[PDB]
Scaffold this active site. Sequence first.
Site, PDB file in Angstrom:
ATOM      1  N   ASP A  88       0.810  -1.212   0.000  1.00 20.27           N
ATOM      2  CA  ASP A  88       0.000   0.000   0.000  1.00 20.27           C
ATOM      3  C   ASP A  88       0.845   1.265   0.000  1.00 20.27           C
ATOM      4  OD1 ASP A  88      -2.501  -1.443   0.157  1.00 20.27           O
ATOM      5  OD2 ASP A  88      -2.052  -1.801   2.274  1.00 20.27           O
ATOM      6  N   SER A 141       2.127   6.914   0.715  1.00 22.81           N
ATOM      7  CA  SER A 141       1.332   6.178   1.694  1.00 22.81           C
ATOM      8  C   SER A 141      -0.137   6.413   1.374  1.00 22.81           C
ATOM      9  CB  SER A 141       1.662   6.616   3.117  1.00 22.81           C
ATOM     10  OG  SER A 141       0.811   5.983   4.056  1.00 22.81           O
ATOM     11  N   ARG A 142      -0.803   5.387   0.839  1.00 20.94           N
ATOM     12  CA  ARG A 142      -2.202   5.520   0.452  1.00 20.94           C
ATOM     13  C   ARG A 142      -3.141   5.561   1.650  1.00 20.94           C
ATOM     14  NH1 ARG A 142      -0.110   1.807  -2.974  1.00 20.94           N
ATOM     15  NH2 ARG A 142       0.027   2.346  -5.193  1.00 20.94           N
ATOM     16  N   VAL A 143      -2.689   5.113   2.818  1.00 16.40           N
ATOM     17  CA  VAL A 143      -3.553   5.000   3.986  1.00 16.40           C
ATOM     18  C   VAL A 143      -3.367   6.267   4.817  1.00 16.40           C
ATOM     19  CG1 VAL A 143      -4.027   3.582   6.062  1.00 16.40           C
ATOM     20  CG2 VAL A 143      -3.415   2.490   3.891  1.00 16.40           C
TER      21      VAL A 143
END
Lengths: 57, 125
Positions: free
Chosen positions: B87, B112-114
């Site tokens: 991710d 960082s997609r989160v």
Amino acid sequence: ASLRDIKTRINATKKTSQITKAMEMVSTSKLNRAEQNAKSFVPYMEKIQEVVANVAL
Amino acid sequence: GKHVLVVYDDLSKQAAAYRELSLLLRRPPGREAYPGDIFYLHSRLLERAAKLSDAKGGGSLTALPFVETQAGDISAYIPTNVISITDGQIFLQSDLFFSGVRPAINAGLSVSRVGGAAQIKAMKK
């Protein structure tokens, strides 16, 4: 060397080349405008020289 | 219902060992002599980390796999395979390390997609 570093090196050199070319282009116009100011200065200096060359004595 | 952090230290060395075994078994090779199922291997390993719902207990498991690059080549087979799965990625550079900038996280390349959901309100602010 590493191809990644080589590409980054080439890209940075290209960016610097573009910046320097823009600078030279600007300086050309600035010189072209400054030459006319020098030419416009010349007559007053010539008149003052031919005026003050004798009465100074 | 617990929370677990798992660190894998060399997925590159795991892949090298699997390549050795596959070549000793005389399986057909792919690019860089790697077997065709190396991505299947790594995806099967990494997808077991999850955040469980409240019905399943609410537990969680997070993974931090490690990949080493040769001369910063992130376009290689294993680096691309691991990048396409996770991710997010954190990039460390020796150029930043030697210039006194350590820890050497490169914020430009890191992703960082989160992000945001994984921060407190003040930190988001």
